[PDB]
Amino acid sequence: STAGKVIKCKAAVLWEEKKPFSIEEVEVAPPKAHEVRIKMVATGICRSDDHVVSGTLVTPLPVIAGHEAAGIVESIGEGVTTVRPGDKVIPLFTPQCGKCRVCKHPEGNFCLKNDLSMPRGTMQDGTSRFTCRGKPIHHFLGTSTFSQYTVVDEISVAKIDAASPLEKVCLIGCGFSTGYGSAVKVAKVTQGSTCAVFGLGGVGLSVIMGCKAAGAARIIGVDINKDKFAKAKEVGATECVNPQDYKKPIQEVLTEMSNGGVDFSFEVIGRLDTMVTALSCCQEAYGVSVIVGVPPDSQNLSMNPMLLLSGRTWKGAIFGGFKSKDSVPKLVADFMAKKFALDPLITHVLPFEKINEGFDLLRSGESIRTILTF
């Protein structure tokens, strides 16, 4: 009944940095060729959405943010082949065009059609499908999931299991798949190893889950907020350390605890200092350190390259290293088969209209993931 029509709906518009979202009426254009219009069912609040509000992550404003979500296809544009109206879908903040040199590489997942390197905040055709107060509103990572309806390019959506519980599997759209893959795919954590995970929010907890699945013997969670430790242990942390409790720098503490450095370290915060600390705490000859945290816009870190010359490996990754459109349906199939759990990441559930309370819960330290329901 809305097919081929402009939809008027509620969305959370960010007009300026460091301001609350404005819940207001937007107009959502119908999909053009190779585009898909999705009725949102559930969206998580990721720290990367908050980085947009803070200006730590730069993307054009005004914007509809939100990138961790699940919904049901309302309609398809001409030429769409991979989803149909009524399908359950997760939007892909990292697309999979299937055509570019990265998509064709066996170990690449950062498709060259992404809007993350040089954000334009548009559809692939350089235009917006959102109007508010008669003005065009930017898209966010090709997703924009803080709206009752969104329009995505076909390369930025995956069809999932028709019986999927969308109020859980939204997390497969970002935080779970990012942390889990950071361990199983990017670091390739080995059986019997010692891991260190810096940051025990939803992504860091998912890194722990992946380290445990990979059979790590020791998983040391590190967080300045000791209220994060109990859940970190529930999902597999063998020990938790608060840097604030020690006189020595934490890389020194972790190097001692692991009898000369950890096998695998993960930076899951987004601070330059912890990126260098996490590198430093992995064993100097054969340690691996993964950057998962999104750093503050345009800022460089400083480091001593003797950290690498001894033998360390340093790497980072988007979305866990997963090829998004191949991986997300498989991840949902595994979730349905109970190969991993998402409920440990969900601490709060709120209606969409309470999005600003959801951001307050994240900022205060109280939540892991809040799931917003439409």
Add this chain to the structure above:
Amino acid sequence: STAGKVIKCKAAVLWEEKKPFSIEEVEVAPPKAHEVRIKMVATGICRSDDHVVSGTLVTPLPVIAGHEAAGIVESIGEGVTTVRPGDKVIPLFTPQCGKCRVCKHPEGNFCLKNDLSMPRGTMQDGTSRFTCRGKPIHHFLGTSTFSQYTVVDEISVAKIDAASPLEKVCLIGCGFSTGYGSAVKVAKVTQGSTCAVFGLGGVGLSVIMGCKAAGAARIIGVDINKDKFAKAKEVGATECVNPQDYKKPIQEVLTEMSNGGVDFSFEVIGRLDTMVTALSCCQEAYGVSVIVGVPPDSQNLSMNPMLLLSGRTWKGAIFGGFKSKDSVPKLVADFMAKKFALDPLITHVLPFEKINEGFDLLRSGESIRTILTF
């Protein structure tokens, strides 16, 4: 006949930074338990020896430098089981104790008994075997090969093929093995890949040899000294570029030449700027960059961690990642079986007492490796 006796011989002593080597009469103590005294046959001049003169590489002075060598065991201390008098041997500037967590790890080669991380310039027991007019002279990297005789710890020497030509296989003690391993073991260059090699000295030429052996399709050599290009192309470079020829940064030139970044890059100079340039020029989703060059003492580089979050891998290694005592004999056996060539690296052969002429040749840019012969 000299077993158990002090040996009076000539060595090249570095008394002061930025001064010529001084040929001195030194006394070489007989080897103590688990020590081996070696008569030198040939030693290469590596840019790392020059980094001691320049103060780039800090080690206690006065010192007998030299680390890339081959010779014949003159005598063994109590308990030595791995070499006998008369054996051909290569000193190992990276030891292999076989007992530390690194030596037991399948990948690691930076044995914890090394004198590279915080140089002391001694034997394992904390003393020196060298005196000059009553004054103790420091060891360098547990090798000290700029001497007619040296004493090394048993963990810092490998027995090699009795038939091997010492005037060639001395390069297995450092520059050949470093560059070749960096490519074949550390980076794991793949068939049909595009590689970029920064620095076309003996170590960079050995990285090109390794890239070619691994079946790279394109090997781009980068050097500010265009006299290095002919020999780079002889050992497998498909193209050479001089950053001084271009009115834009070489990382942009190489990204354009490689249609959006190279598979594998190697920094084989020892400059912080080229370390970052080399990382940048590898493809942002799946590229790998290896630091080989020794950085200037205590200096940090600056870099944008978004270079790694996209998917790059950054690593470094000592001695090409080879477990020294295991690998050296097998590299020499491979040379004897014509699996690789060393003559392309050797531009000059001088007697030992002409060491300062050999360093002048390196500094002028004329030579790749000068071999000093005894």
